[PDB]
From Swiss-Prot:
Gene transcribed to yield this protein: recA
Annotated organism of origin: Mycolicibacterium smegmatis (strain ATCC 700084 / mc(2)155)
BP-aspect Gene Ontology terms: DNA recombination; DNA repair; SOS response
Family to which the UniProt record says this protein belongs: Belongs to the RecA family.
Assembly with partners or alone: Polymerizes non-specifically on ssDNA to form filaments. Interacts with and activates LexA leading to autocatalytic cleavage of LexA, which derepresses the SOS regulon and activates DNA repair.
DNA damage keyword on record: yes
Recorded phenotype for the gene knockout or disruption: Not essential in the absence of DNA damage, its deletion renders cells much more sensitive to DNA damaging agents such as UV light, ionizing radiation, alkylating agents and DNA gyrase inhibitors and desiccation-induced DSBs. 5-fold decrease in survival, loss of HR, no change in NHEJ (non-homologous end-joining) or single-strand annealing DSB repair.
Name of the featured protein: Protein RecA
GO CC annotation: cytosol
Binding site for phosphate: 67-71, 184
Amino acid sequence: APDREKALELAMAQIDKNFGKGSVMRLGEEVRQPISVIPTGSISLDVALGIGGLPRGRVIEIYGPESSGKTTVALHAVANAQAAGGIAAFIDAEHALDPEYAKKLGVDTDSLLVSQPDTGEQALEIADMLVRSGALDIIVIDSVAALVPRAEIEGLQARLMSQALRKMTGALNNSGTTAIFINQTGGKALKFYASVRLDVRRIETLKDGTDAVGNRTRVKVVKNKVSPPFKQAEFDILYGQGISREGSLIDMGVEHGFIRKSGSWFTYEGEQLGQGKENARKFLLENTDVANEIEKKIKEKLG
């Protein structure tokens, strides 16, 4: 009965010791909690991460198929980091960004540090020195696959990438700046350096009755060295409004009881919210007072 675990316990101990914390976990441990993390902007996912957001100082990767969310999540990461006083950097390699939309997500475009390098070898250095001023909070490279090296422009990528990754990884940990990498490629490197990888995919094209308000998405946390991995969260991203914070309260609201679905009628302890997800969504939208209370409750019922 005892001894085995005890040997295990000690085992699992020494591992983490020489290999860090997330070395050995259980798809059941409720462990850790850093006083630092960035709200995804969708609790659903925040919880997904276990820690309630992104592990600062860690290199995260959010890969997904063309037109899944990725950037959106990302720009959210950058917006929530922003509204906290620290400022964000955008390494542009895709030359495709819609500030407006960003602004709508919450991005302070005027104060967003961007840079459209010339070769893949160039961005990284930029990102690397720019990250060395530890003045940044969230730096985000856009398009791992759009990092063509000096050579080709005149197995390169993987290499090019590995190099900085090892280099930038060190510092990132020392400065407390968390990094984002969009992907589709450079594979290897990132695969391993990243301490958290999100796999994002668009499941349903949200039916608005009319023709479409957005799309319901799903992110699977294939790799999480800071909490139990393999989790996942689903949320909606309304065309031109980003992730509906309200849209999420409901889902968690119900998947955790704080709200009752009485047959296409949403109710919150006594009084009803609305009749229909969007209706109740509308409801909370204009009833933030109550809205945050749910978020609050949900955060209390879990952390």
